[PDB]
């Protein structure tokens, strides 16, 4: 949580939005993934959203689906992901790190044990994709006990009741869905209820979309498939992959500045 607070405070003083890229840990391999992440940060990423390879990402589109597939093909496990996370935090002490998880991987060895592990490696937030606010109690409680920000999703059709819940239960940032489906007004209400700063996600793949998000009042934007697409398109060229990632991220981040 603290890292997000500091980040948003610093960005606000510069009148700029945050650009948060998403990538699957271990895709296409442990070593290359670590290089990809360092590149994203050196390119301008304000924060990171990192997925742990899961056998059934029912909230992700084809692009992300294959990202997990490549990660599994590399033998990447949750344990190895936490080792990567520890190292990433050791290299970058201030960048907020959020995980994109699926319930079973959190519940597996105990919900409390999972959040305790997140705190130990330096994770800042956790978004459990298949846990709606209605079932969030044990997850958000465990998160808060370990100084982890529980991230809630605010759908485009969210009603007043949901907005109030997301505003009171969420921390770090409020995930604002740009649409329905899977990966591939509300803002004013959230601020009125003192919700965590909003980051728009889903479908964000161009600089103009980042500028629009910030102009709409959002604190920033999240982009995943656009990032992952660059990875699967340059699998045969690791060096070219990083070069293209740096170019895309720098362009997206530039669009968030005032």
């Amino acid at each position: 949580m603290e890292r997000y607070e500091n980040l948003f405070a610093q960005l606000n003083d510069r009148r700029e939005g945050a650009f948060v890229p998403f990538v699957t840990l271990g895709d296409p391999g442990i070593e290359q993934s670590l290089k990809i992440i360092d590149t994203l940060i050196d390119a301008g990423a304000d924060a990171l959203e990192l997925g742990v390879p899961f056998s059934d990402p029912l909230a992700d589109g084809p692009t992300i689906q294959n990202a997990n597939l490549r990660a599994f093909a590399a033998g990447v496990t949750p344990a190895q992901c936490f080792e990567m996370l520890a190292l990433i935090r050791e290299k970058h002490p201030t960048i907020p790190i959020g995980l994109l998880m699926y319930a079973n991987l959190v519940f597996n060895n105990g919900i409390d044990a999972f959040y305790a592990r997140c705190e130990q490696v330096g994770v800042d937030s956790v978004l459990v994709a298949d846990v709606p606010v209605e079932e969030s109690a044990p997850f958000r409680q465990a998160a808060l006990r370990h100084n982890i920000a529980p991230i809630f999703i605010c759908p485009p059709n969210a009603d007043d009741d949901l907005l109030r819940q997301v505003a009171s239960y969420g921390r770090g940032y409020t995930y604002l869905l740009s649409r329905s489906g899977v990966t591939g007004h509300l803002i004013e209400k959230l601020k009125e209820y003192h919700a965590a700063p909003a980051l728009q996600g889903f479908g964000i793949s161009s600089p103009e979309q980042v500028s629009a998000a910030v102009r709409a009042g959002a604190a920033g934007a999240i982009s995943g498939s656009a990032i992952v697409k660059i990875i699967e398109k340059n699998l045969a060229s690791p060096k070219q992959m990083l070069a293209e990632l740096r170019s895309f991220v720098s362009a997206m981040k530039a669009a968030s500045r005032a």
Binding site: A103, V133, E135, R179, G181, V182
Partner: protein, 394 residues
């Protein structure tokens, strides 16, 4: 909040992305309304009776029990239109879809049986049906795929993941999470996020209700036990439901043991799996030590669901129902036995239930007992499978 309890003890819930909650709430509300609507009940009863062929017979099998004190009856869901119990609930769900003003149906299927049932119900009720099926199952179930298309349903192969049922289950959700406004997701078993476990049980409970009336008419008393196979849990809970409050009636669910529990190649998550959260519910499931979802193995494709309905996990926890397993060979033996002694070819799925009943009889032949086995489906579809085996064994 919800109108009904989404949990059966610690099991169940609604573990789906936030975007799908309105769809679940709408469905629960429509279901609750439908259940109190005489017009809905009349229409559903009309379809079940005049289209599906209900009530189904309760057949006394005197040949197979000769020489023992066991009296065995088979609830004939194999005589239901479609050849399996699945037809009951797909008709009910199709009606719910129309009640909500939807004209499109989304379904998932592994062995293809649920896909065929969804397709027939959709064709009858004028709904546009689209079905997701794992590529591994598509090429392995060519017959069912052709049946689905013959009935006007669109079949879409799924190559993601292990390309099986679980993989199809995810792809179906992804689709619904962006079209629930005009399409209804026709889940195929008594599992998944609330209210599906409840809706499917209620749309299958006529199995147990009919069985009770029939057994009372024929024997003047309730069964000592009702036995049913458990893949996802729909035919079992359908048989169990009306007997839950009849404490003297044993409820026995049979999971597939595959090559044997100790081999690790089986489909018995309720008694040998580990509780997890997947497919929108908290329930016992086949998973790795790390929490990755695995597949369930069984000679019978129909019992391939890697998890189990939450109400079954609950009934087990409180001791109201007992669950056991039957191996591929025990099911095969039961299949052959019913064919030769009663002239009925049972589905390999149902053969697991029969196999356990045969064990109850054979292990204690002098034990006086009145048993009912839910014959969930016919086995004409399993002919080749059984043949290839007997052949590969000489």
């Amino acid at each position: 909040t919800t109108l009904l309890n989404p949990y059966f003890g610690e099991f169940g819930g609604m573990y789906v992305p936030q975007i799908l909650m309105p769809a679940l709430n709408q469905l629960e509300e429509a279901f609750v309304s439908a259940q109190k609507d005489p017009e809905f009940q009349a229409q559903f009863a009309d379809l079940l009776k005049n289209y599906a062929g209900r009530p189904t017979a309760l057949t006394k099998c005197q040949n197979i029990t000769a020489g023992t004190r066991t009296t065995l009856y088979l609830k004939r869901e194999d005589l239901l239109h479609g050849g399996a119990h699945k037809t009951n609930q797909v008709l009910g769900q199709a009606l719910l879809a129309k009640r909500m003003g939807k004209s499109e149906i989304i379904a998932e299927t592994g062995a293809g049986q649920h896909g065929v049932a969804s397709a027939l119900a959709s064709a009858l009720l004028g709904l546009k049906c689209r079905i997701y099926m794992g590529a591994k199952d598509v090429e392995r179930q060519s017959p069912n795929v052709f049946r689905m298309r013959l009935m006007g349903a669109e079949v879409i192969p799924v190559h993601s993941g292990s390309a099986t049922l679980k993989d199809a289950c995810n792809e179906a959700l992804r689709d619904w999470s962006g079209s629930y406004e005009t399409a209804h997701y026709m889940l195929g078993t008594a599992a998944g996020p609330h209210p599906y476990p409840t809706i499917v049980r209620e749309f299958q409970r006529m199995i147990g209700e009919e069985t009770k009336a029939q057994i009372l008419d024929k024997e003047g008393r309730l069964p000592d036990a009702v036995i049913a196979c458990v893949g996802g849990g729909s035919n079992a809970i359908g048989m169990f439901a009306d007997f839950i409050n009849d404490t003297s009636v044993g409820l026995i669910g049979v999971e597939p043991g595959g090559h044997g529990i100790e081999t690790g190649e089986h489909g018995a998550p309720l008694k040998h799996g580990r509780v997890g959260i997947y497919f929108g519910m908290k329930a016992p499931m086949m998973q790795t030590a790390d929490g990755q979802i695995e597949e369930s193995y069984s000679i019978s494709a129909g019992l391939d669901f890697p998890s189990v309905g939450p109400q079954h996990a609950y009934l087990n926890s409180i001791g109201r129902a007992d669950y056991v397993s039957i191996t591929d060979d025990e099911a095969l033996e039961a299949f052959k036995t019913l064919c030769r002694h009663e002239g009925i070819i049972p589905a390999l799925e149902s053969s697991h239930a029969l196999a356990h009943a045969l064990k109850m009889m054979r292990e204690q032949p002098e034990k006086e007992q009145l048993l009912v086995v839910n014959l969930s489906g016919r086995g004409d579809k399993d002919i080749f499978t059984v043949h290839d085996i007997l052949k590969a064994r000489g």
